[PDB]
From a paper:
The iron-dependent regulator IdeR is the main transcriptional regulator controlling iron homeostasis genes in Actinobacteria, including species from the Corynebacterium, Mycobacterium and Streptomyces genera, as well as the erythromycin-producing bacterium Saccharopolyspora erythraea. When iron levels are sufficient for iron ions to occupy the IdeR metal-binding sites, the regulator is activated and recognizes a highly conserved 19-bp sequence located in the promoter region of its target genes.
To clarify the relevance of the base interactions with the recognition helix of IdeR, we generated two IdeR variants, IdeRQ43A and IdeRP39G, that should disrupt base interactions while not affecting backbone interactions. Due to the special structural features of both proline and glycine residues we cannot conclude whether this loss of affinity is caused by the absence of the vdW interactions with the DNA, or if this protein variant is functionally impaired. However, as IdeRP39G is still able to recognize its target and form a stable complex, we can reason that the absence of IdeRWT binding to the Consensus_T3-G3 sequence was not caused by the disruption of the vdW interactions between Pro39 and the thymine in position 3. We also obtained the crystal structure of IdeRP39G bound to the consensus DNA to confirm that no other interactions with the essential thymines of the recognition sequence are formed in this IdeR variant. Despite the drastic difference between the wild-type and mutated residue, in the DNA-bound state the structure of the recognition helix is essentially unaffected by the mutation. The hydrogen bond formed by the backbone carbonyl group of residue 39 with the water molecule, which is also bound to Gln43 and the cytosine in position 2 of the repeat, is not disrupted by the mutation.
Numbering used by the authors:
A (entry chain C): 2 to 139, 146 to 231
B (entry chain aa): 149 to 230
C (entry chain D), D (entry chain A): 2 to 143
E (entry chain B): 2 to 139, 144 to 231
F (entry chain dd): 149 to 231
DNA sequence: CGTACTTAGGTTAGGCTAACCTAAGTCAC
DNA sequence: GTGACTTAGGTTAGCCTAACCTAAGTACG
């Protein structure tokens, strides 16, 4: 699937992995953007040459000040696009991320400033994710816990707060989550599970569903 | 077909006309677009097209808020109803 | 200046020249997109290979059935984007076209159908240019 | 040591092991070609994908109809090269195999036919190993 | 076709172009080995990194002492392979180059030394091309009197003796079968018909018949004029 | 097959045998191939295979020009016709 | 004497498969 | 414990198309 801008999508994938608390290896970029290991290293090398990132001792990718700034501007465009598509245009909830993943690469700062006024200074995306870099354009979340860790700790009732970009990429799953009512601002019951890499059962208001470990890891909640 | 280009109207001896279309070619020059808006050469507004003689000659137009000089390629890319 | 999509910008440039009543020669594309004559000849040959256009005897570029359909969908997205940027977002009149020239390459037909409803069945761009291919969109699930 | 052709050297290695009466496991290839176990599993999977071999329940590698045919043509070239290098060129008895192991990957069936006539219809290599697939060659334009 | 060894085939293509008196541009390598301009630049860059060649002011490729030595050892293996295939094995004249272009990448110095003895210290390939690097392995004739069929034709033509068919011409087996049929082969006389201007098909009359040679082909056939 | 492997002949109680085949596995050791040629373990030559007891024990052979010790994997990869 | 186009040689970004690696982790006996 | 594979994250060589460039032609009016 066409990235529109390869560089900006590498920067944003690193930013997504950080938000999800995943070590940003080149193998993560490879599996997410569906490219060969060589392509990723070759592209990561061009971005190191341009001075947007560096490779650390344990081979995890670190953003430079210019790289982080650029990564933030892309993520800001993405989430303002999602707000516009949901609040104003009225695009279906499950289709909004895929549209915004293209729009993020063509939106000027001039449109961003106009969208901030139109949308009334929004601070979160329609999937509960904070909108960064609003200061550059012109809340404590330390209590939030991941559905997998909650389940491994005995489960219980919790309020859905965030669905990460990773989960948004699968429109079928997002349609399923909306149906059963695993959406931001709704309460869910997380059933307990032992060990790791195990499917996690969750009961929403309208029904129940299973979340894969990497999915459940990317859904942040506030426990009762 | 009922619409006419500003350059042809000027060469034909000018006249009063309703601005209908500004082609994509003109829109690529923001500074020109600002000037066109300022003097009032915008869709729905009436303009006076001054008579011109020759080819590659600037076309003089009068809008509600003043006048401007259009280059031949610009005047060709603005369509009006006479 | 980044075209975002080379093929779509060649198709729309040929489309613009036809609307202006100018002969669409390779030299016109070279001027308007600020590329060398060799690049235009090469890209045109690639688009001729892919069945998007043909070259006539007088050497003027002609859009195929497939070429014209693609050109129309790009122009439809362009002019619906312009209407959104002026009427809803409130971007300045003179800055809208440059924004819409990037947006036209990333807008889905799904968004297009929502813009038709939002903007109340627009027939023209803010610059009075007719929106083509509106009947091609349909109403989807609505 | 450069294999020249990985596929042909995997096929001939499995062929060698069957001739020796040894169970052809991935681990045998790893030892003999001096590659990591992961490289062998990976290359074997490519060759299984391309229909050259299958893995049995006891995990021993089996050449398909297509795999055995390719293995036989490599071994035929190998043992005809050995006969040429000893009988005609006069390369030392102990150096011949290492030479023939490279030559087997570049010899055409056209040269093979000329070598059969030159060497007087050989049935074995200089080391007494039968030359397989001689009936597959034919006589060409003779 | 598969190059077997990319590096050795790049080195030998530069050597072939020098022997044919053609400026060795990356565009020449792209044509002959049928690869993209980017592929050639990327591969040439790897060989520059290894110190086998360098890019000159006019962007023509120059071999280093290591690169030239390696290029010579490949061309030696090639032409000793061609001798073996013709003289001993008896492979058809038109098919020998294609076989030799693969064998040149796998032949050891050990086999080269044995082939020199077997073939009786040959100095030329079966297509009349001198065999280099025989000294490195363990009286060369003055060839300054030799002229290219195209230059002879542009100078008014006339009778000449065929001496060399370059590696370039050998790549086309159908052309080589045609050359052999009409008798445009080393050690045979030909009548070269005169032509006006460059980039013109050159007519030649052999002992058994006549044929037309393309400018690049005629340029790659060396003769001694009556 | 009527052919037998040197390692199996040794374990059976040895004997005189005609060398028939040297597998590709053996040929990959030039130093071993030189020794095999020197002592006379080559196709068409007769050798004496000395009786051996157990597994992983080196096999002793006597050629026309002397004797050599074959490793089990080497002895397995040499095929003979027992007199 | 320009305008339109072709020719020749080249660069860059962004992809791919094949064929190797090291280094832990797992599995059947 | 041992041998036989799997997994996880890499590298390198050797290819590709698309989309640009400069420079110096030829073609035509
Ligand atoms: Co999103
Ligand atoms: Co994106
Ligand atoms: Co516009
Ligand atoms: Co555009
Ligand atoms: Co052998
Ligand atoms: Co081999
Ligand atoms: Co040759
Ligand atoms: Co070659």
């Amino acid at each position: 699937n066409d990235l529109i801008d390869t560089t900006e999508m590498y920067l944003r994938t690193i930013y997504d992995l950080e938000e999800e608390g995943v070590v940003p290896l080149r193998a993560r970029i490879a599996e997410r953007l569906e490219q060969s290991g060589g392509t990723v290293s070759q592209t990561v090398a061009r971005m190191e040459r341009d001075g947007l990132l560096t490779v650390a001792e344990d081979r995890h990718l670190e953003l430079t000040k210019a790289g982080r700034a650029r990564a933030i501007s892309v993520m800001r465009k993405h989430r303002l696009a999602e707000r516009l598509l949901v609040d104003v245009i009225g695009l279906e909830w499950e289709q909004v991320h895929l549209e915004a993943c293209r729009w993020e690469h063509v939106m000027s700062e001039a449109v961003e400033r106009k969208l901030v006024k139109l949308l009334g200074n929004p601070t979160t995306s329609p999937y509960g994710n904070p909108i960064p870099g609003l200061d550059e354009l012109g809340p404590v979340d330390t209590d939030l816990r991941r559905v997998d860790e909650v389940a491994r700790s005995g489960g219980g009732r919790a309020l859905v707060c965030r669905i990460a970009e990773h989960v948004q990429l699968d429109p079928d799953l997002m349609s399923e989550l909306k149906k059963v009512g695993v959406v931001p601002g709704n309460e869910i019951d997380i059933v307990a599970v032992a060990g790791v890499n195990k499917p996690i059962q969750v009961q929403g208001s309208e029904g129940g569903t299973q979340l894969q470990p990497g999915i459940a890891h990317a859904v942040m909640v506030r426990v009762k | 077909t009922d619409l006419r280009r500003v350059d042809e109207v000027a060469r034909s001896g000018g006249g009063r006309a309703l601005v209908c279309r500004i082609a994509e070619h003109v829109q690529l020059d923001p500074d020109l677009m600002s000037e066109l808006k300022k003097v009032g050469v915008v869709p729905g507004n009436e303009i006076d097209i001054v008579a011109v003689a020759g080819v590659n000659k600037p076309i003089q137009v009068q809008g509600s808020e003043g006048g401007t000089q259009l280059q031949p390629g610009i005047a060709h890319a603005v369509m009006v109803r006479v | 200046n980044d075209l975002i999509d080379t093929t779509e910008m060649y198709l729309r440039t040929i489309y613009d020249l036809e609307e202006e009543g100018v002969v669409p020669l390779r030299a016109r594309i070279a001027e308007r997109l600020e590329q060398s004559g060799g690049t235009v000849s090469q890209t045109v040959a690639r688009m001729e290979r892919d069945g998007l256009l043909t070259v006539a005897e007088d050497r003027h570029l002609e859009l195929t059935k497939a070429g014209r359909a693609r050109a129309i969908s790009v122009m439809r997205k362009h002019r619906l984007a312009e209407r959104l940027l002026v009427d809803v977002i409130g971007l300045e009149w003179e800055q809208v076209h440059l924004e819409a020239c990037r947006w036209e390459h990333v807008m889905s037909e799904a968004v297009e159908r929502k813009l038709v409803k939002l903007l109340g069945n627009p027939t023209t761009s803010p610059y009075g240019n007719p929106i083509p291919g509106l009947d091609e969109l349909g109403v989807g699930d609505s």
